[PDB]
Amino acid sequence: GIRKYKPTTPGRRGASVSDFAEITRSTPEKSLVRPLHGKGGRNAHGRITTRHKGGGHKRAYRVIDFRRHDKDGVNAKVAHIEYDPNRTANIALLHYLDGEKRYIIAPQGLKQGDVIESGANADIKPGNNLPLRNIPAGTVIHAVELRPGGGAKLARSAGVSIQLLGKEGTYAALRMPSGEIRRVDVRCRATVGEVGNAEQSNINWGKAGRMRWKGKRPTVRGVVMNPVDHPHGGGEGKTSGGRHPVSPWGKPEGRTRKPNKPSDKLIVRRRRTGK
RNA sequence: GGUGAUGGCCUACCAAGGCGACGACGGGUAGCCGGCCUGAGAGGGUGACCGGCCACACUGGGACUGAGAUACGGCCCAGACUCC
RNA sequence: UAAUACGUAGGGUCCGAGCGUUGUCCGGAAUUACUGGGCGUAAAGAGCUCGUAGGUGGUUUGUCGCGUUGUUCGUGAAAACUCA
RNA sequence: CGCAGAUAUCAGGAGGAACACCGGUGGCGAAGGCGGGUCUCUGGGCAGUAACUGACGCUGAGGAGCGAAAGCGUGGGGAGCGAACAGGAUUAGAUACCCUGGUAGUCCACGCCGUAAACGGUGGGUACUAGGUGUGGGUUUCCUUCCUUGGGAUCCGUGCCGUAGCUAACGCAUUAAGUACCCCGCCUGGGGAGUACGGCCGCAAGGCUAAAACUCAAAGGAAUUGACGGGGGCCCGCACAAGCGGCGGAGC
RNA sequence: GCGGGUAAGACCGCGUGGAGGCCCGAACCCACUUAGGUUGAAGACUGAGGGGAUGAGCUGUGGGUAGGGGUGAAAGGCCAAU
RNA sequence: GAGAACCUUGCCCGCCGAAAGACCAAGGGUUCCUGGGCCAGGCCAGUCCGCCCAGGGUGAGUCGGGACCUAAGGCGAGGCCGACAGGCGUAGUCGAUGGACAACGGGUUGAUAUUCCCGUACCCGUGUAUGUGCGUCCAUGAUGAAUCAGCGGUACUAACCAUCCAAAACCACCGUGACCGCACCUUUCGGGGUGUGGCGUUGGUGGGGCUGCAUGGGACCUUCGUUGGUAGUAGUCAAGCGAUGGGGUGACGCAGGAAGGUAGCCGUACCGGUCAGUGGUAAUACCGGGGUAAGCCUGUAGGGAGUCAGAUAGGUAAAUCCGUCUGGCAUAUAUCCUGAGAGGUGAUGCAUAGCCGAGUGAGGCGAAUUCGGUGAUCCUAUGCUGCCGAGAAAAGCCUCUAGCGAGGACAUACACGGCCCGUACCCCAAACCAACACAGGUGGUCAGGUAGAGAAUACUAAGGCGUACGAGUGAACUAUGGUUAAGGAACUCGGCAAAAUGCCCCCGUAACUUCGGGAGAAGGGGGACCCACAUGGCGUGUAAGCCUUUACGGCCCAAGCGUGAGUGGGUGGCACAAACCAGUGAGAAGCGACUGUUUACUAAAAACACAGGUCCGUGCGAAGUCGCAAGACGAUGUAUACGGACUGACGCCUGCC
RNA sequence: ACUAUAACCAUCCUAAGGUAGCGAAAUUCCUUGUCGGGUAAGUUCCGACCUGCACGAAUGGCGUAACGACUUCUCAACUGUC
RNA sequence: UACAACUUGGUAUUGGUGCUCGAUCGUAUUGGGCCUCUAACCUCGGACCGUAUAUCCGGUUCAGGGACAGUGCCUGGUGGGU
Ligand SMILES: [Mg+2]
Ligand SMILES: [Mg+2]
Ligand SMILES: [Mg+2]
Ligand SMILES: [Mg+2]
Ligand SMILES: [Mg+2]
Ligand SMILES: [Mg+2]
Ligand SMILES: [Mg+2]
Ligand SMILES: [Mg+2]
Ligand SMILES: [Mg+2]
Ligand SMILES: [Mg+2]
Ligand SMILES: [Mg+2]
Ligand SMILES: [Mg+2]
Ligand SMILES: [Mg+2]
Ligand SMILES: [Mg+2]
Ligand SMILES: [Mg+2]
Ligand SMILES: [Mg+2]
Ligand SMILES: [Mg+2]
Ligand SMILES: [Mg+2]
Ligand SMILES: [Mg+2]
Ligand SMILES: [Mg+2]
Ligand SMILES: [Mg+2]
Ligand SMILES: [Mg+2]
Ligand SMILES: [Mg+2]
Ligand SMILES: [Mg+2]
Ligand SMILES: [Mg+2]
Ligand SMILES: [Mg+2]
Ligand SMILES: [Mg+2]
Ligand SMILES: [Mg+2]
Ligand SMILES: [Mg+2]
Ligand SMILES: [Mg+2]
Ligand SMILES: [Mg+2]
Ligand SMILES: [Mg+2]
Ligand SMILES: [Mg+2]
Ligand SMILES: [Mg+2]
Ligand SMILES: [Mg+2]
Ligand SMILES: [Mg+2]
Ligand SMILES: [Mg+2]
Ligand SMILES: [Mg+2]
Ligand SMILES: [Mg+2]
Ligand SMILES: [Mg+2]
Ligand SMILES: [Mg+2]
Ligand SMILES: [Mg+2]
Ligand SMILES: [Mg+2]
Ligand SMILES: [Mg+2]
Ligand SMILES: [Mg+2]
Ligand SMILES: [Mg+2]
Ligand SMILES: [Mg+2]
Ligand SMILES: [Mg+2]
Ligand SMILES: [Mg+2]
Ligand SMILES: [Mg+2]
Ligand SMILES: [Mg+2]
Ligand SMILES: [Mg+2]
Ligand SMILES: [Mg+2]
Ligand SMILES: [Mg+2]
Ligand SMILES: [Mg+2]
Ligand SMILES: [Mg+2]
Ligand SMILES: [Mg+2]
Ligand SMILES: [Mg+2]
Ligand SMILES: [Mg+2]
Ligand SMILES: [Mg+2]
Ligand SMILES: [Mg+2]
Ligand SMILES: [Mg+2]
Ligand SMILES: [Mg+2]
Ligand SMILES: [Mg+2]
Ligand SMILES: [Mg+2]
Ligand SMILES: [Mg+2]
Ligand SMILES: [Mg+2]
Ligand SMILES: [Mg+2]
Ligand SMILES: [Mg+2]
Ligand SMILES: [Mg+2]
Ligand SMILES: [Mg+2]
Ligand SMILES: [Mg+2]
Ligand SMILES: [Mg+2]
Ligand SMILES: [Mg+2]
Ligand SMILES: [Mg+2]
Ligand SMILES: [Mg+2]
Ligand SMILES: [Mg+2]
Ligand SMILES: [Mg+2]
Ligand SMILES: [Mg+2]
Ligand SMILES: [Mg+2]
Ligand SMILES: [Mg+2]
Ligand SMILES: [Mg+2]
Ligand SMILES: [Mg+2]
Ligand SMILES: [Mg+2]
Ligand SMILES: [Mg+2]
Ligand SMILES: [Mg+2]
Ligand SMILES: [Mg+2]
Ligand SMILES: [Mg+2]
Ligand SMILES: [Mg+2]
Ligand SMILES: [Mg+2]
Ligand SMILES: [Mg+2]
Ligand SMILES: [Mg+2]
Ligand SMILES: [Mg+2]
Ligand SMILES: [Mg+2]
Ligand SMILES: [Mg+2]
Ligand SMILES: [Mg+2]
Ligand SMILES: [Mg+2]
Ligand SMILES: [Mg+2]
Ligand SMILES: [Mg+2]
Ligand SMILES: [Mg+2]
Ligand SMILES: [Mg+2]
Ligand SMILES: [Mg+2]
Ligand SMILES: [Mg+2]
Ligand SMILES: [Mg+2]
Ligand SMILES: [Mg+2]
Ligand SMILES: [Mg+2]
Ligand SMILES: [Mg+2]
Ligand SMILES: [Mg+2]
Ligand SMILES: [Mg+2]
Ligand SMILES: [Mg+2]
Ligand SMILES: [Mg+2]
Ligand SMILES: [Mg+2]
Ligand SMILES: [Mg+2]
Ligand SMILES: [Mg+2]
Ligand SMILES: [Mg+2]
Ligand SMILES: [Mg+2]
Ligand SMILES: [Mg+2]
Ligand SMILES: [Mg+2]
Ligand SMILES: [Mg+2]
Ligand SMILES: [Mg+2]
Ligand SMILES: [Mg+2]
Ligand SMILES: [Mg+2]
Ligand SMILES: [Mg+2]
Ligand SMILES: [Mg+2]
Ligand SMILES: [Mg+2]
Ligand SMILES: [Mg+2]
Ligand SMILES: [Mg+2]
Ligand SMILES: [Mg+2]
Ligand SMILES: [Mg+2]
Ligand SMILES: [Mg+2]
Ligand SMILES: [Mg+2]
Ligand SMILES: [Mg+2]
Ligand SMILES: [Mg+2]
Ligand SMILES: [Mg+2]
Ligand SMILES: [Mg+2]
Ligand SMILES: [Mg+2]
Ligand SMILES: [Mg+2]
Ligand SMILES: [Mg+2]
Ligand SMILES: [Mg+2]
Ligand SMILES: [Mg+2]
Ligand SMILES: [Mg+2]
Ligand SMILES: [Mg+2]
Ligand SMILES: [Mg+2]
Ligand SMILES: [Mg+2]
Ligand SMILES: [Mg+2]
Ligand SMILES: [Mg+2]
Ligand SMILES: [Mg+2]
Ligand SMILES: [Mg+2]
Ligand SMILES: [Mg+2]
Ligand SMILES: [Mg+2]
Ligand SMILES: [Mg+2]
Ligand SMILES: [Mg+2]
Ligand SMILES: [Mg+2]
Ligand SMILES: [Mg+2]
Ligand SMILES: [Mg+2]
Ligand SMILES: [Mg+2]
Ligand SMILES: [Mg+2]
Ligand SMILES: [Mg+2]
Ligand SMILES: [Mg+2]
Ligand SMILES: [Mg+2]
Ligand SMILES: [Mg+2]
Ligand SMILES: [Mg+2]
Ligand SMILES: [Mg+2]
Ligand SMILES: [Mg+2]
Ligand SMILES: [Mg+2]
Ligand SMILES: [Mg+2]
Ligand SMILES: [Mg+2]
Ligand SMILES: [Mg+2]
Ligand SMILES: [Mg+2]
Ligand SMILES: [Mg+2]
Ligand SMILES: [Mg+2]
Ligand SMILES: [Mg+2]
């Protein structure tokens, strides 16, 4: 749920968080951790590519099985549903009857002690992965893939996941959280059930310190920049920039997608706003 | 310890209680009563005189005298008033 | 414009060594409804429930009689009211 | 809104709200109110056996829970409808009635707010008091075909009309305003004003508790007859319609 | 956790717990006021005071970002007193 | 010494003493010591110097940098891309500020020291050969698996009992695509409507048998209940070391609390000395000491975790290892791991205050070497609890196996064997960075006593300094300060500055409010010393005592030590938080929510920034970036995410075009 | 309906012609606007009126507890600032 | 006045069939539009190999796309980003 904090000090009056009362562990499975580090928003050159990002609290990366096909026909137990900061959602560790422990995303309403099976024969209960040949139309799924074994790439959205629509030939149409419908091949794999932490968006940062914690640096407003460094820069006082807003590099709002994409044909329609 | 006489009347130490919605404590009003006016009555109002009590003595306090002091024209101090 | 309602006259009415005005208080005021109110619309049943305290109890079998009336002497000052 | 191919019309797809007929002066719920179905958990009410407890009863200041719609927060949803808002129109004037559209809201989840002509304008519970006409619910019992709103009786809820009574009257009339009992809310002429100040609640809009001054000598209720009605039924007139001829032009 | 309280609550008193860009205040980091200095002790200080002071903190360490570019909690600041 | 404030020695005085002392790193590189001289340098002289001139001085298997491993990142064979140059990045190899392996105390010269000497230890590397003692070249154990003869009432194939449905329309009615018409109505006759008759149906079954196929029953020939000889006759080795491979291990945040110890201190005892120009102390009292390591033993407080057998293909192959599942044994202070600290040895040693002869000062002798109590920011701790913002890698080590194999494993007497380079000095400073012997900056370690909360502050030890111009003069005037009659902001733009309050404990504290605050709001009272309560509460805890899974064990703890607080009585003083140190307060309002950041070197705000929202873009080899390219960021993220822009907590709102 | 008003209608034109809130304010030039509070005296301040030259609702409006080496003003102590 | 970037078409990396539309209702005009397919091309899907270790890369197989896309050259737009 949500616990609103009590306004002891001024910088802590609006800070409301979600209670992680469900976790069971306090130190991640060490056989499945790799080194990571705040990249600082810099490419091979070292020149900053994306602003606002860099610094913050160091984090430890863990490899988690979005490839969930390497094991089929072998069940696993939901060992412990632990928390990784690196990702929005929650990762739950599974014990396989084989003897592997692999990390995966924790779907909504999943609790320790349930059973997990991964294959074309699995049941339809939430938390099971299986190519879309074997999944009824209309169900709600997540952690979807974009081709037969390229690794799930879409709908990791903590709190939202895709909706299957209809199978024709070798493609399936998906209603998906951006409000868009995508034709995609049906040989991919997916899992049934909404993702967990549906209340994550309820967090109120409330304190610049924690924003820094999560890592992003401050944003320097437009009309305050100097005119040399940015189109709206300048103006003794507050002046709109005398022109329609524009990105710091001279391109204003409006369409940006490069159509003609290999997936341009695969897309059905385009997202709607204010409809 | 104190009082003509028991008692937080006063003192010390113990326990945290006592009073409170069958109206505490707070605020405005006003001497109480036998009585006076009214009303068939219950009741309402009210406290002129007389009378039974209370409290007061230029305003605030305190104490002596003795069987008996709120001691009106008894005492002391402080303020006001008037005067030598 | 033609007053039994203004003023003047007469005449009359009530009262009277007092006659009016004013003001306080009771009455009719059952107009704070105990005696002795009402709640549909005239003013009023809260929006409807459970239920603490309080208020109230479906029967007879049994005592103490503290609610009660029962009587006897035993208090109720004087003054005021009622009788002669 | 259409000649960029509208409407219509046919195939397919999407998606949200709501379930006609059953469906009524009917069920239930204490009250708001509640009905397309299926399953899941579950509340309340009634009939016969009357087995058992045995004065446990009633209702309730404060308190606390429930409580239509509108409104507010958070995040989803958002077909239709639709405050506000634009235009078109009538009108002297229309910031409306009407038309085109159309954002809040309307729906979901959790919190809120607690007011309605929240009406049966009637607090709850018990006992008694002539009937007539129906529904639904459950029981029995007999003409007995034992088919059968065939007949009898019973108790619960539910519509209308009616005696006596009561009532200001309209009206109620055993599901009372009757005749009593027990408890609780409430009112004392109309404005002022359910508002100002205050206390409490609410994040708010505001809600709850609840004043005085000054002014008026009436405001209100049911009912009687008029009058009138861009309210209804039945009637009549160069009233209308069909015809001629006319005045409003000129002089007189 | 216990005692009140619910029917479960919720709520409250009591003790424990010690969160906090919480408070006062040294090191450290800053630069608000005044004074002196302004051919100074100093190409920016000294002294009195002055704010934060468990954090968006500070600091050693070594690395990358090169000029019309970097960087820039944005002042036309910094990028070796420029 | 020619000269002497400035140097050497001595006496006193002052100053720092979380440094103005002592160690290092970075840095500098002879500034270290000794000897000689004083032109030049030192803001003066100068015998002195961080001057110059000569000589001397730096001693390591155990400290540090390479032999080791790695982060950020750099380089980069091939490779990809690029007009050239080059830019990328794989395998790899570099890259400390990290991880890994071993040292203590005393003594020593004018300079070095965990390096030299003394005494006592250690851990790594090679080898010895014997004592344990183990095979391959004998052979015993557990099993284990690649081979010939069939079965799952389930149920291939003609049927039976029972259940709902109808393909080749019989019987009956009815509506009538359309045809034949019987009576009436209608425009004068026509069309047409109504009622009915015969079919036909705009809307083709029932009855019965032959045959063939479809749905279950037993059985016929081929499919078993793994052996009957054989072939424990023969090919296999594990020892011992075996990886560019696998697994554990190493291996990790902030904050908080408490307990146990030490460094270290205080008093006691013990030891040695003590007679102080002065009243009184010749020991009751004073001065000084009272230390002692690593390693090797012990393994406590304490922290974490339970023991055997079978099978499982999962960890790129295989595994006795690690994970998993089954049973057996276990909840035993059982077992294992970790582990500061304490006791013993280390140590009959050393050092030691001082005694003696000997002076630029060395040398021999050498007493006591206990206790308690306080107590850390140091250690247990990389631990425990709790939070979200969820807190490196690799190596070494242990262990498991892939490729071998007729000689390794384990200890020890043994004398052997361990590099090179740094090592002097300075190192909050006249030695580094500032052009200087400059009031500046510079990271880590050590942290005494009395007061105090203290790492502030005041005075002091250890130890080092008075940092290089002096002497003399009551003037202005400037600067640093102290005091001031009365008035108290009247100056002045401004109460600028100055003055002022200032601690602890108690009482009581408004408006307002986001119910936290406001609030230390304001305001007030006590505070010194002595005595008593008291030989007080508290902690600590000895002897003794008690108990026992008997030990570094549990109960009491007289004794002893340390000990806040308060109440009463008394007393001195102007004053009792007297020093240093140590909030001015309140009222009304403007702007900004605040913590915060910024114009180094004139502006710290109302600017910036943010936490809140809004709009838009962004379908994942994403949007947008850097890059004439590969490619990298975005992100090892996925619309509850990311980018861009605007406003800026929160509440009411955010109108019209 | 005494007195100054527009609170109603007609004009043009553009798309409309500033709603709530506040308002001589950080915006108000006349201007020291006018009035009242504070002072003996107040061109600053506070509180109102609205004739807003030239406010105004995300280059956000209005209030807002707390915060501030922020702005203005007043008061008691305080003092050689005078 | 240009240019970076973004965007169009033709042309090339370029293949085939079926349909439907034209100027010398039964005789003729070669290209446009669509549906397919693999084979050019892409693939940041998979799985092998170089390899004893290689997420780069190269080759092989398959899988998805597929004559699109990308890329050049000409060209038109937009173009204070320079
Ligand atoms: Mg907040
Ligand atoms: Mg952990
Ligand atoms: Mg990782
Ligand atoms: Mg570069
Ligand atoms: Mg950004
Ligand atoms: Mg950092
Ligand atoms: Mg998360
Ligand atoms: Mg979408
Ligand atoms: Mg911005
Ligand atoms: Mg700026
Ligand atoms: Mg720049
Ligand atoms: Mg520009
Ligand atoms: Mg500007
Ligand atoms: Mg401007
Ligand atoms: Mg734009
Ligand atoms: Mg007695
Ligand atoms: Mg008493
Ligand atoms: Mg006593
Ligand atoms: Mg009196
Ligand atoms: Mg009486
Ligand atoms: Mg009476
Ligand atoms: Mg009476
Ligand atoms: Mg009386
Ligand atoms: Mg008398
Ligand atoms: Mg009297
Ligand atoms: Mg008496
Ligand atoms: Mg008196
Ligand atoms: Mg007297
Ligand atoms: Mg008298
Ligand atoms: Mg007298
Ligand atoms: Mg007259
Ligand atoms: Mg008269
Ligand atoms: Mg008369
Ligand atoms: Mg009267
Ligand atoms: Mg009454
Ligand atoms: Mg009424
Ligand atoms: Mg009512
Ligand atoms: Mg109400
Ligand atoms: Mg009696
Ligand atoms: Mg008697
Ligand atoms: Mg009597
Ligand atoms: Mg008498
Ligand atoms: Mg009488
Ligand atoms: Mg249609
Ligand atoms: Mg019975
Ligand atoms: Mg009751
Ligand atoms: Mg009751
Ligand atoms: Mg009540
Ligand atoms: Mg009550
Ligand atoms: Mg409730
Ligand atoms: Mg409730
Ligand atoms: Mg509604
Ligand atoms: Mg609603
Ligand atoms: Mg609203
Ligand atoms: Mg809401
Ligand atoms: Mg919404
Ligand atoms: Mg919708
Ligand atoms: Mg409408
Ligand atoms: Mg309109
Ligand atoms: Mg509409
Ligand atoms: Mg109401
Ligand atoms: Mg209703
Ligand atoms: Mg009711
Ligand atoms: Mg009743
Ligand atoms: Mg009736
Ligand atoms: Mg009657
Ligand atoms: Mg009734
Ligand atoms: Mg009645
Ligand atoms: Mg009244
Ligand atoms: Mg009212
Ligand atoms: Mg109130
Ligand atoms: Mg109210
Ligand atoms: Mg009426
Ligand atoms: Mg009538
Ligand atoms: Mg006519
Ligand atoms: Mg005429
Ligand atoms: Mg005429
Ligand atoms: Mg605490
Ligand atoms: Mg702070
Ligand atoms: Mg302070
Ligand atoms: Mg000087
Ligand atoms: Mg300089
Ligand atoms: Mg300073
Ligand atoms: Mg000062
Ligand atoms: Mg400070
Ligand atoms: Mg401060
Ligand atoms: Mg901070
Ligand atoms: Mg360079
Ligand atoms: Mg430039
Ligand atoms: Mg600027
Ligand atoms: Mg500028
Ligand atoms: Mg510079
Ligand atoms: Mg000399
Ligand atoms: Mg000092
Ligand atoms: Mg210090
Ligand atoms: Mg010190
Ligand atoms: Mg250095
Ligand atoms: Mg060096
Ligand atoms: Mg020297
Ligand atoms: Mg010399
Ligand atoms: Mg010389
Ligand atoms: Mg010289
Ligand atoms: Mg020399
Ligand atoms: Mg190469
Ligand atoms: Mg490279
Ligand atoms: Mg590389
Ligand atoms: Mg290396
Ligand atoms: Mg290194
Ligand atoms: Mg040395
Ligand atoms: Mg040494
Ligand atoms: Mg920690
Ligand atoms: Mg401790
Ligand atoms: Mg002496
Ligand atoms: Mg000693
Ligand atoms: Mg395994
Ligand atoms: Mg060796
Ligand atoms: Mg060397
Ligand atoms: Mg040295
Ligand atoms: Mg040195
Ligand atoms: Mg030094
Ligand atoms: Mg120099
Ligand atoms: Mg110097
Ligand atoms: Mg210096
Ligand atoms: Mg420093
Ligand atoms: Mg310290
Ligand atoms: Mg000193
Ligand atoms: Mg010293
Ligand atoms: Mg001077
Ligand atoms: Mg002076
Ligand atoms: Mg003085
Ligand atoms: Mg003065
Ligand atoms: Mg000042
Ligand atoms: Mg305050
Ligand atoms: Mg406060
Ligand atoms: Mg205070
Ligand atoms: Mg003991
Ligand atoms: Mg014992
Ligand atoms: Mg025991
Ligand atoms: Mg004194
Ligand atoms: Mg403001
Ligand atoms: Mg500020
Ligand atoms: Mg600040
Ligand atoms: Mg800032
Ligand atoms: Mg700044
Ligand atoms: Mg500066
Ligand atoms: Mg500056
Ligand atoms: Mg400044
Ligand atoms: Mg900001
Ligand atoms: Mg917003
Ligand atoms: Mg925005
Ligand atoms: Mg937006
Ligand atoms: Mg892209
Ligand atoms: Mg702003
Ligand atoms: Mg103003
Ligand atoms: Mg303002
Ligand atoms: Mg202004
Ligand atoms: Mg002005
Ligand atoms: Mg003015
Ligand atoms: Mg002034
Ligand atoms: Mg204006
Ligand atoms: Mg303007
Ligand atoms: Mg707007
Ligand atoms: Mg705006
Ligand atoms: Mg703007
Ligand atoms: Mg604003
Ligand atoms: Mg406010
Ligand atoms: Mg003043
Ligand atoms: Mg003075
Ligand atoms: Mg072309
Ligand atoms: Mg082509
Ligand atoms: Mg241009
Ligand atoms: Mg230009």
Tab-separated table of N, CA and C (backbone and C1' of nucleotides) in Angstrom, chain H residues 6 17 27 29 32 34 38 49 63 66 74-75 79:
chain	number	residue	atom	x	y	z
H	6	C	P	19.690	13.917	-41.754
H	6	C	O5'	18.304	14.690	-41.684
H	6	C	C5'	17.470	14.580	-40.543
H	6	C	C4'	16.071	15.040	-40.852
H	6	C	C3'	15.444	14.432	-42.097
H	6	C	O3'	14.855	13.169	-41.848
H	6	C	C1'	15.179	16.775	-42.148
H	17	U	P	7.457	-11.847	-66.305
H	17	U	O5'	6.353	-12.601	-65.437
H	17	U	C5'	6.149	-13.997	-65.586
H	17	U	C4'	4.981	-14.490	-64.768
H	17	U	C3'	3.655	-13.788	-64.996
H	17	U	O3'	2.992	-14.229	-66.165
H	17	U	C1'	4.020	-14.062	-62.678
H	27	U	P	-10.817	-8.510	-82.913
H	27	U	O5'	-9.806	-7.289	-83.057
H	27	U	C5'	-8.410	-7.478	-82.865
H	27	U	C4'	-7.603	-6.666	-83.846
H	27	U	C3'	-6.409	-5.919	-83.264
H	27	U	O3'	-5.247	-6.727	-83.165
H	27	U	C1'	-7.709	-4.434	-84.560
H	29	U	P	-0.658	-3.053	-78.045
H	29	U	O5'	0.733	-2.533	-77.467
H	29	U	C5'	0.816	-1.299	-76.771
H	29	U	C4'	1.223	-0.170	-77.683
H	29	U	C3'	1.122	1.226	-77.087
H	29	U	O3'	2.253	1.577	-76.309
H	29	U	C1'	0.071	1.205	-79.195
H	32	G	P	6.796	2.484	-65.073
H	32	G	O5'	5.763	3.630	-64.677
H	32	G	C5'	5.122	3.620	-63.411
H	32	G	C4'	3.690	4.080	-63.515
H	32	G	C3'	2.744	3.538	-62.455
H	32	G	O3'	2.795	4.285	-61.252
H	32	G	C1'	1.756	3.328	-64.601
H	34	C	P	1.210	-0.536	-54.728
H	34	C	O5'	-0.008	-0.891	-55.688
H	34	C	C5'	-1.346	-0.829	-55.217
H	34	C	C4'	-2.036	-2.158	-55.372
H	34	C	C3'	-1.301	-3.348	-54.776
H	34	C	O3'	-1.573	-3.495	-53.393
H	34	C	C1'	-2.020	-3.862	-56.977
H	38	U	P	9.449	-17.434	-51.027
H	38	U	O5'	10.811	-17.410	-51.848
H	38	U	C5'	11.075	-18.394	-52.841
H	38	U	C4'	12.273	-18.023	-53.673
H	38	U	C3'	13.579	-17.915	-52.900
H	38	U	O3'	14.662	-18.239	-53.768
H	38	U	C1'	13.028	-15.806	-53.798
H	49	C	P	31.286	-24.890	-31.795
H	49	C	O5'	32.465	-24.484	-32.782
H	49	C	C5'	32.918	-25.403	-33.760
H	49	C	C4'	33.377	-24.709	-35.014
H	49	C	C3'	34.475	-23.677	-34.845
H	49	C	O3'	35.755	-24.263	-34.719
H	49	C	C1'	32.799	-22.828	-36.275
H	63	A	P	14.248	-21.614	-43.237
H	63	A	O5'	14.158	-20.671	-41.960
H	63	A	C5'	13.513	-21.107	-40.773
H	63	A	C4'	13.168	-19.934	-39.897
H	63	A	C3'	12.579	-18.741	-40.631
H	63	A	O3'	11.181	-18.862	-40.814
H	63	A	C1'	14.357	-18.013	-39.262
H	66	G	P	7.952	-8.272	-46.176
H	66	G	O5'	8.917	-7.813	-47.350
H	66	G	C5'	9.737	-6.670	-47.187
H	66	G	C4'	10.946	-6.737	-48.076
H	66	G	C3'	10.679	-7.140	-49.512
H	66	G	O3'	10.187	-6.075	-50.300
H	66	G	C1'	12.501	-8.377	-48.686
H	74	C	P	25.177	16.267	-57.297
H	74	C	O5'	23.840	16.098	-58.145
H	74	C	C5'	23.787	16.486	-59.508
H	74	C	C4'	22.364	16.667	-59.965
H	74	C	C3'	21.520	17.573	-59.091
H	74	C	O3'	21.694	18.930	-59.443
H	74	C	C1'	20.340	15.571	-59.541
H	75	U	P	21.383	20.091	-58.388
H	75	U	O5'	19.800	20.067	-58.272
H	75	U	C5'	18.994	20.032	-59.436
H	75	U	C4'	17.589	19.619	-59.100
H	75	U	C3'	16.984	20.323	-57.905
H	75	U	O3'	16.477	21.594	-58.259
H	75	U	C1'	16.565	17.995	-57.765
H	79	G	P	11.987	28.219	-43.348
H	79	G	O5'	13.387	27.914	-42.662
H	79	G	C5'	13.462	27.058	-41.535
H	79	G	C4'	14.831	26.451	-41.407
H	79	G	C3'	15.990	27.392	-41.670
H	79	G	O3'	16.299	28.197	-40.552
H	79	G	C1'	16.332	25.385	-42.850
